[PDB]
UniProtKB/Swiss-Prot annotation:
Species lineage: Bacteria, Pseudomonadati, Pseudomonadota, Gammaproteobacteria, Enterobacterales
Full protein: residues contained: 90 to 148 of 613
Protein name: RNA polymerase sigma factor RpoD
Subunit structure: Interacts transiently with the RNA polymerase catalytic core formed by RpoA, RpoB, RpoC and RpoZ (2 alpha, 1 beta, 1 beta' and 1 omega subunit) to form the RNA polymerase holoenzyme that can initiate transcription. Identified in a complex containing RpoD, the RNA polymerase subunits RpoA, RpoB and RpoZ, CRP and DNA. Interacts with Rsd; this prevents interaction with the RNA polymerase catalytic core and with promoter DNA, and as a consequence, promotes transcription from promoters that require alternative sigma factors. (Microbial infection) Interacts with Escherichia phage lambda antitermination protein Q.
Localization terms from the record: Cytoplasm
Family recorded in the similarity comment: Belongs to the sigma-70 factor family. RpoD/SigA subfamily.
Top-level taxon of origin: Bacteria
Organism expressing this protein natively: Escherichia coli (strain K12)
Main function: Sigma factors are initiation factors that promote the attachment of RNA polymerase to specific initiation sites and are then released. This sigma factor is the primary sigma factor during exponential growth. Preferentially transcribes genes associated with fast growth, such as ribosomal operons, other protein-synthesis related genes, rRNA- and tRNA-encoding genes and prfB.
Amino acid sequence: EIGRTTDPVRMYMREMGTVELLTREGEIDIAKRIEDGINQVQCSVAEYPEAITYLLEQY
DNA sequence: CCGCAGATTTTTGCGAAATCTTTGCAGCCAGAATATAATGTGTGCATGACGGCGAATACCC
């Protein structure tokens, strides 16, 4: 905080204090939205032919 | 003071090996790959000169 501080440790703790801890199912929900995003990007790559041609070349 | 002997000088020759690059090997080493249970906490704070001094906010009049 603004306490005439000059230690990066202190305000790093300040930064980490803003975000609240997660639960077991919270991690699963966040990973689920991550999986939705990666499936979206996989579909986007899917609609692109040339990347698939390159993948088939390596196969 | 001159020509040959001892000493010194001239010339041709072979073995040896080391070095530079390439190839095979072994110790060194780097990244890539796998899914054990663990999230607001630690932490060092070590501490008794003395004089000068401006800068930085506070507070009375």
